[PDB]
Amino acid sequence: VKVNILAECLKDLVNAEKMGKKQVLLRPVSKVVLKFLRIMQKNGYIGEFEVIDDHRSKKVVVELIGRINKCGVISPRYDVPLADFEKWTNNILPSRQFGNVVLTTTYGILTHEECRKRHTGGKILGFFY
Amino acid sequence: MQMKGKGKGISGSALPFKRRSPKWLHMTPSTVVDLSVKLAKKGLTPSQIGVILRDQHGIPQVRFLTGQKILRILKKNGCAPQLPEDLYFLIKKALSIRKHLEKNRKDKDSKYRLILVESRIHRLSRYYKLNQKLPPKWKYNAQTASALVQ
Amino acid sequence: GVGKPRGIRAGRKLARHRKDQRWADNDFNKRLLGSRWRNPFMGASHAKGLVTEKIGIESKQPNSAVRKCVRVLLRKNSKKIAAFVPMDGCLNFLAENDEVLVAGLGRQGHAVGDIPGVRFKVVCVKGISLLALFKGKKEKR
RNA sequence: GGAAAAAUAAGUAAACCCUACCAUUUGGAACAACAAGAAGUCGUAACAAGGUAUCUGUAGGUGAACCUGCAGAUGGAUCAUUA
RNA sequence: AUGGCAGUCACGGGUAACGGAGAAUUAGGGUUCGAUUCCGGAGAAGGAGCCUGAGAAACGGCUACUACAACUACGGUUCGGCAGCAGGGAAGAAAAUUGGCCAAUCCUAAUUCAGGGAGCCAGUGACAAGAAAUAGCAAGCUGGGAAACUUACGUUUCUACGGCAUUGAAAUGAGAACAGUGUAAAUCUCUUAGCGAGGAACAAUUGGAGGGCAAGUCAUGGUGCCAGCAGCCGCGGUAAUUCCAGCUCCAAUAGCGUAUAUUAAAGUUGUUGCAGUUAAAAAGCUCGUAGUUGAACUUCUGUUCAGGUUCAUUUCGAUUCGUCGUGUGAAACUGGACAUACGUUUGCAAACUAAAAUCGGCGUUCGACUUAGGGAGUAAACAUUUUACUGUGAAAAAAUUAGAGUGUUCCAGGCAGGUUUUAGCCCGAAUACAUUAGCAUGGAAUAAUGGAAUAGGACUAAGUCCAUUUUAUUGGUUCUUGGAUUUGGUAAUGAUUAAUAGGGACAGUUGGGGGCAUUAGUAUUUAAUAGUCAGAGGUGAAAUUCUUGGAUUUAUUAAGGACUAACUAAUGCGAAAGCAUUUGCCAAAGAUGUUUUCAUUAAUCAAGAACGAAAGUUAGGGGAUCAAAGACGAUCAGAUACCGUCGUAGUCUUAACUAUAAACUAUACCGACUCGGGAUCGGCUGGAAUAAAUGUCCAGUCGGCACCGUAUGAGAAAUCAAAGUCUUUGGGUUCUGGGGGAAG
Numbered sequence A: 001v002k003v004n005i006l007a008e009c010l011k012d013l014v015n016a017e018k019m020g021k022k023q024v025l026l027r028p029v030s031k032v033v034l035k036f037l038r039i040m041q042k043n044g045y046i047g048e049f050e051v052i053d054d055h056r057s058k059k060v061v062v063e064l065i066g067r068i069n070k071c072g073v074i075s076p077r078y079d080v081p082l083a084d085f086e087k088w089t090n091n092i093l094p095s096r097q098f099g100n101v102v103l104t105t106t107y108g109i110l111t112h113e114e115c116r117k118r119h120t121g122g123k124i125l126g127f128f129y
Numbered sequence B: 001m002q003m004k005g006k007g008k009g010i011s012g013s014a015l016p017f018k019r020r021s022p023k024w025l026h027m028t029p030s031t032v033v034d035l036s037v038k039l040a041k042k043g044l045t046p047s048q049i050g051v052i053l054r055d056q057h058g059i060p061q062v063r064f065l066t067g068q069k070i071l072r073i074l075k076k077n078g079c080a081p082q083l084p085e086d087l088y089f090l091i092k093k094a095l096s097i098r099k100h101l102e103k104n105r106k107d108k109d110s111k112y113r114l115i116l117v118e119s120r121i122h123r124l125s126r127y128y129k130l131n132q133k134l135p136p137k138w139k140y141n142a143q144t145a146s147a148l149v150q
Numbered sequence C: 001g002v003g004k005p006r007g008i009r010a011g012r013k014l015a016r017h018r019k020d021q022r023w024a025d026n027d028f029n030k031r032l033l034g035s036r037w038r039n040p041f042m043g044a045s046h047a048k049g050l051v052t053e054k055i056g057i058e059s060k061q062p063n064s065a066v067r068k069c070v071r072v073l074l075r076k077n078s079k080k081i082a083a084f085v086p087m088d089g090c091l092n093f094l095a096e097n098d099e100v101l102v103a104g105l106g107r108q109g110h111a112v113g114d115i116p117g118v119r120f121k122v123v124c125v126k127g128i129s130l131l132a133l134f135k136g137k138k139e140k141r
Numbered sequence D: 001g002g003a004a005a006a007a008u009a010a011g012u013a014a015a016c017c018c019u020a021c022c023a024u025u026u027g028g029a030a031c032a033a034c035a036a037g038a039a040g041u042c043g044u045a046a047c048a049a050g051g052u053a054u055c056u057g058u059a060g061g062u063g064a065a066c067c068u069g070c071a072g073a074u075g076g077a078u079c080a081u082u083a
Numbered sequence E: 001a002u003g004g005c006a007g008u009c010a011c012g013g014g015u016a017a018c019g020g021a022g023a024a025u026u027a028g029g030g031u032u033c034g035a036u037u038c039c040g041g042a043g044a045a046g047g048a049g050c051c052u053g054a055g056a057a058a059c060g061g062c063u064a065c066u067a068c069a070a071c072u073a074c075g076g077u078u079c080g081g082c083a084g085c086a087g088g089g090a091a092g093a094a095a096a097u098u099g100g101c102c103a104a105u106c107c108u109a110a111u112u113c114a115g116g117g118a119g120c121c122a123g124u125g126a127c128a129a130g131a132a133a134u135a136g137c138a139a140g141c142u143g144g145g146a147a148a149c150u151u152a153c154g155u156u157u158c159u160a161c162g163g164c165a166u167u168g169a170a171a172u173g174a175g176a177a178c179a180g181u182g183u184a185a186a187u188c189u190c191u192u193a194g195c196g197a198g199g200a201a202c203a204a205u206u207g208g209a210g211g212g213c214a215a216g217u218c219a220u221g222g223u224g225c226c227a228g229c230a231g232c233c234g235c236g237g238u239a240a241u242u243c244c245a246g247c248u249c250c251a252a253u254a255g256c257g258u259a260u261a262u263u264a265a266a267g268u269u270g271u272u273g274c275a276g277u278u279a280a281a282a283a284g285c286u287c288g289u290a291g292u293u294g295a296a297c298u299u300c301u302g303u304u305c306a307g308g309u310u311c312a313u314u315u316c317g318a319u320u321c322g323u324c325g326u327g328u329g330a331a332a333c334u335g336g337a338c339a340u341a342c343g344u345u346u347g348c349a350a351a352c353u354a355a356a357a358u359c360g361g362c363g364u365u366c367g368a369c370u371u372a373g374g375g376a377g378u379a380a381a382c383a384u385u386u387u388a389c390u391g392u393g394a395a396a397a398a399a400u401u402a403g404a405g406u407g408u409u410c411c412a413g414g415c416a417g418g419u420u421u422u423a424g425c426c427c428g429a430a431u432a433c434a435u436u437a438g439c440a441u442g443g444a445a446u447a448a449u450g451g452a453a454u455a456g457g458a459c460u461a462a463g464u465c466c467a468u469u470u471u472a473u474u475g476g477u478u479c480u481u482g483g484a485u486u487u488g489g490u491a492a493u494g495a496u497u498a499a500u501a502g503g504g505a506c507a508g509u510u511g512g513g514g515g516c517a518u519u520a521g522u523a524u525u526u527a528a529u530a531g532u533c534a535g536a537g538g539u540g541a542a543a544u545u546c547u548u549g550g551a552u553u554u555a556u557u558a559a560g561g562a563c564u565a566a567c568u569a570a571u572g573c574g575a576a577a578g579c580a581u582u583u584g585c586c587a588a589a590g591a592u593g594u595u596u597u598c599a600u601u602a603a604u605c606a607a608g609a610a611c612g613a614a615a616g617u618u619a620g621g622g623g624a625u626c627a628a629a630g631a632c633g634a635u636c637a638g639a640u641a642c643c644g645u646c647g648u649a650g651u652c653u654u655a656a657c658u659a660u661a662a663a664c665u666a667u668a669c670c671g672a673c674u675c676g677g678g679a680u681c682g683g684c685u686g687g688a689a690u691a692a693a694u695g696u697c698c699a700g701u702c703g704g705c706a707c708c709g710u711a712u713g714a715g716a717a718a719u720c721a722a723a724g725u726c727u728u729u730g731g732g733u734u735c736u737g738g739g740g741g742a743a744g
């Protein structure tokens, strides 16, 4: 069946920027899918976006700037102590210059980087660069 | 698409947007609740009752109008169909198969088909039992089926 | 997904799988099955022995030659050994019944491409390194 | 009254034997067997539609490779012909 | 009484397995070891027993047995157990002196003085680690050069320079030594006088020179597939670039080869990070509990204040060899507050305001001082229970990292720095990491879990009953405090949507899906009824075969067993194997259609089951055709083979059993995406013509085989619309592979 729609939505989107789509329609959407989205948006990867009210679980449409190179999730969302960071930064990110490894915390959801600010982080969620 | 590594499609049914009751219709929740329980008393499936209220008395979605789902309405009014359509029917055909098999003790495609159908029933029991929506000592074997036949 | 399962709750599975699918390695399968202990040296690096006789063996495929070899009897092990005597005149020093020290040739298994069923090298005669006997100014008895 | 040897019963239980079983090592032969190699010997299976094809399964026969029946698959010697 | 444990691996077996601290290599993750200075455990020849004591089953104590060691006048005895040191024997690839002392570290005792193979000294000692010499300088000759002087090979000069069986004196440890230091003594080191270097010397090896793998293009000598080399390619058979050796070269260099186990290269065991059409690898196919994996909703949000933070700066003040302060904007953090909005009580502190009092001036203008009031400000009680994350408590020392620190550098020790305050001064022995399980604690995400649905819950008041603390104590009342009910009041009383998830209901319809019946049709045989006439049949040719007791042949008809033609095609259905004459029953299925219910019920799956052409098997049927074995002809040098004539088992069936097949798309299932295009099969919805057809066409569209074109997507390529969305390496799950042959 379906799982981690964040992943469903995410790749559907990558496939977008990769194919050169002008905009994308993500079918199954959730708070997570949206938060991640406004985090990419806030950092300037995706453009303006609209959430249509599917009386079941909303559908979102994201405008595509053309700067997204890749944005995926990470299989089981392992736990990650602040000490476990460089491991993943050198692992997932294409450089020490596009630090975008989204994590889930108790302090909500922060950028790979913000988690060092707040000083907590926790489970990995996804990445984008 | 259930027990099918190969076959799969989309039957239909998509509740329209507007969550309110149709304009043209006037019927205090109660009005319907009567028809519903009356119809039910005659011996009807909440599954079938709803069908009437749509085909016959233009009530698209009883839930939207009452703020009550059929089976609930029925249960509140003592008119609750003991065993759920779900299980009931599966067991029905599950049985029909057995009868046919007897006089055709050789029909293999049917032995198989029953195996699948009996398999499902064990899946519902697991479920309906876990939602304390069916006594734990429930057991469909051959006697549970013939028990309902009487 | 691929074959391997990616669950945070399914570590056990992956674990047992690796321990299992791992027997497919010979290097593993080898040391794991106390195989090293059953060879003629009994794991050992070297072994002493008595010369049972100097025999010669023929080269294989594109080569044709009389290889110098000594049949040795290992001490505590007590096995018949096929041992290749190195360099040129070498066998001229090995007197029958003397004590010899033998070691393998490149990873215990395949003999040098040329040799047939020989798996050992001879390094000492009466406890005198061969090389030593090979160069005049060194030693001789 | 204390108290040595002796003797006593239940007990801990050494060794030994018998009855089963486990583990680890190590052993054994003529004929036989296995391994590898070749311009040994007899033929030619396979490649080439390799004398009108291989190949899988199963069955039966034969100096030998293999042939043959039934059923498949092309990795075929076809990606094709109701007018 | 009958339990206790187990696939979340019991029980049992192996371990050249005593566990840790740690050790070796390491991008990350890992791989392999830990006999061995710390700690804990076990044991003293094997095994049991015991005395004694605060304390051991001790074992440098005892008893018996098994196997042993020492003496004997053979009666009997041993303070007989080295896995303590030093030594022998043994084993074996393999590990030092039967030395010295109590001086240092500690220990023991009645104990400042005694004893200690603990321990320290020394011997042996290329395990291993640190530093480091085997030469340096210059003249001259000379090659180079080179800058020059300058049409040519000639002079000046200088230089990164570089050569020499030519020159020359300075330098210096090895060495060897009176002294001093040091020491328990002795050895050595260190300081140091007399003595101490010029070519076989006072000294470099080891291992190579085809490729990988740095280095011979020697026309070198010997050898002639011999001797031998070679890690793997391969060298060698008379002109070897790999043998033997010379020469010259290269590499590491007081070191360098070799053997074996092991680390990395190994994305060649892969969680990160592989492969699985054809290279090894998807199971033939479905069901299915364990396991693994699971859709979406529940304070969003706004305004303002504040603390920093950053960043920006048509900018300000300071300092210099690079920072601070100030202002804006901005973001977000935070923390407040307030907004139907993360809490309540307490005590503290309190900050301001509304009243009332008192005090002063002239009821009021105002001011100081009181009660009430919450933020804010702490501590305890609450927010379903964990995961997970923060943080600190705990995680021995040594080791690793690491600060200070010129042990002559360094290993490394933890010391040392200044006598110019010197009967004293200054400064040190820091710090980090420590995951796994436990504790304290901050928390809002994901994830799981939970609360009110039979009803009952919640809050509140009263009534009643049970239980009960302090009231001295015992009763009896009351009462506080818990619990039980009944009632009445209050509250918007209490059940998220309905997943282009899944299960059911229903509706016409579609199919060579299946099981019973039934029913044909030619044909092959064989038989009857007639009909002739000499050949049929079979091959390339013929031959066994059949035939005027009539063949082959023609007509009619019958029996029988199997089979379903032509229509039948990249078209249909079935989980797969498989399934095509008619008609009738029996239970089943997809897809489409749904403003129907149910609402996570689900994906895949070890166990564990249902199927699974052929061929084959058991016991009965049946027996037409074809036909394994067999019998024959022919063909061949050979034919028990490819052709031909016959023929048994089977092939058909009932009931059992067998499970494999190039069981093939050689491409696991569920899910989402992404190129173009028509044509299909099934369903549906609009429309047009005829006509009013279970038809045709146009246009949609779900679902199903399949094809065409194409990819700045994949690949080793063939090729792949998926074999794609994988170094920009991670949706969920099952199975499989790890050079070849021996081998399934």
Ligand SMILES: [Mg+2]
Pocket (backbone or CB within 6 Å): B008, B009
């Ligand atoms: Mg679907």
Ligand SMILES: [Mg+2]
Pocket (backbone or CB within 6 Å): C061
């Ligand atoms: Mg070769």
Ligand SMILES: [Mg+2]
Pocket (backbone or CB within 6 Å): none
């Ligand atoms: Mg041969």
Ligand SMILES: [Mg+2]
Pocket (backbone or CB within 6 Å): none
């Ligand atoms: Mg065959």
Ligand SMILES: [Mg+2]
Pocket (backbone or CB within 6 Å): none
């Ligand atoms: Mg056979």
Ligand SMILES: [Mg+2]
Pocket (backbone or CB within 6 Å): none
């Ligand atoms: Mg054990």
Ligand SMILES: [Mg+2]
Pocket (backbone or CB within 6 Å): E017
């Ligand atoms: Mg170990």
Ligand SMILES: [Mg+2]
Pocket (backbone or CB within 6 Å): none
């Ligand atoms: Mg110890």
Ligand SMILES: [Mg+2]
Pocket (backbone or CB within 6 Å): none
């Ligand atoms: Mg303890």
Ligand SMILES: [Mg+2]
Pocket (backbone or CB within 6 Å): E082
């Ligand atoms: Mg000793």
Ligand SMILES: [Mg+2]
Pocket (backbone or CB within 6 Å): E102
């Ligand atoms: Mg002392």
Ligand SMILES: [Mg+2]
Pocket (backbone or CB within 6 Å): none
């Ligand atoms: Mg003393």
Ligand SMILES: [Mg+2]
Pocket (backbone or CB within 6 Å): E110
């Ligand atoms: Mg005394």
Ligand SMILES: [Mg+2]
Pocket (backbone or CB within 6 Å): none
């Ligand atoms: Mg020493």
Ligand SMILES: [Mg+2]
Pocket (backbone or CB within 6 Å): none
């Ligand atoms: Mg050294």
Ligand SMILES: [Mg+2]
Pocket (backbone or CB within 6 Å): none
């Ligand atoms: Mg002296």
